[PDB]
Amino acid sequence: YNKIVSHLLVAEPEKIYAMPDPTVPDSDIKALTTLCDLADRELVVIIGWAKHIPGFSTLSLADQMSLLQSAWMEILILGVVYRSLSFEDELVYADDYIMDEDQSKLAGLLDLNNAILQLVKKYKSMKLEKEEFVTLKAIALANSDSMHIEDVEAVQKLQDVLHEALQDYEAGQHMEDPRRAGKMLMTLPLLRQTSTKAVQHFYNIKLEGKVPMHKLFLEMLE
Ligand SMILES: CC(C)N1CCN(c2ccc(/C(=C(/CCCO)c3ccccc3)c3ccc(O)cc3)cc2)CC1
């Protein structure tokens, strides 16, 4: 077991809770408030998590911003997916917040979440392990295709470090399947697809607020 995967496991943020309001009756407005409140608390720990990724904090501050601005929804969704593996037709946003099909219909999220459930179903059949989760998550941040990177070279380096770490691990604990790392990489499109659609929905129903995401990430990064 190599040191990248080992440190990435160590850098996992702790459990966040959504704390839905037991007073408020379940409605479509409730769901968004809960998910909004939970996402904001996750975003704070997601930026701490990034800084422990080897080489991330050596990037320029604009490149740190560009990676997080490109990948934040992918990172949120991957977490939901991983927590959902041992459940059935349900998305585990938090240990205290689980959304089944009817609550997704009510939240206006049915199509999004059915796609997120394809991703869950797919990691189930490959028996996805925590070490692959945290490595795929790190790859998703680094492979996020930002429009404006200052140092293309350093960013490709971080890609290739995390890429090699994934290949390394799979060569290690998965000899039964010499193509498992390639299969892992091939689930990255579905994750970009649902995140692309989720971010678009984020903006359709105007959840961005007043402060643009790039200054929020600048504040959190300092
Ligand atoms: C005002 C500004 C500071 N922001 C920052 C971020 N913020 C936000 C970010 C992400 C969502 C996500 C849902 C669920 C996606 C589908 O399952 C979502 C709901 C509606 C539209 C798009 C996404 C979501 C995903 C994973 C997860 O662990 C938790 C939350 C919701 C809100 C609102 C507040």
UniProtKB/Swiss-Prot annotation:
Query: Gene of origin?
Result: ESRRG
Q: What does this protein do?
A: Orphan receptor that acts as a transcription activator in the absence of bound ligand. Binds specifically to an estrogen response element and activates reporter genes controlled by estrogen response elements. Induces the expression of PERM1 in the skeletal muscle.
Q: What is the lineage of its organism?
A: Eukaryota, Metazoa, Chordata, Craniata, Vertebrata
Q: What is this protein called?
A: Estrogen-related receptor gamma
Name all NR LBD domain ranges: 1-222
Give the coiled coil ranges: none
Record's subunit section: Homodimer. Binds TLE1, PNRC1 and PNRC2. Binds GRIP1. Interacts with NRIP1, NCOA1 and NCOR2.
Tissue specificity remark:
Expressed in the heart, kidney, brain, lung, bone marrow, adrenal gland, trachea, spinal cord and thyroid gland.
User: What fragment of the whole protein does this chain represent?
Assistant: 234 to 455 of 458
What PTM annotation applies here?
Acetylated by PCAF/KAT2 (in vitro).
Q: What else is known?
A: No physiological activating ligand is known for this orphan receptor, but 4-hydroxytamoxifen and diethylstilbestrol act as inverse agonists and deactivate ESRRG.
Subcellular localization, per the record? Nucleus
Q: Which family does it belong to?
A: Belongs to the nuclear hormone receptor family. NR3 subfamily.
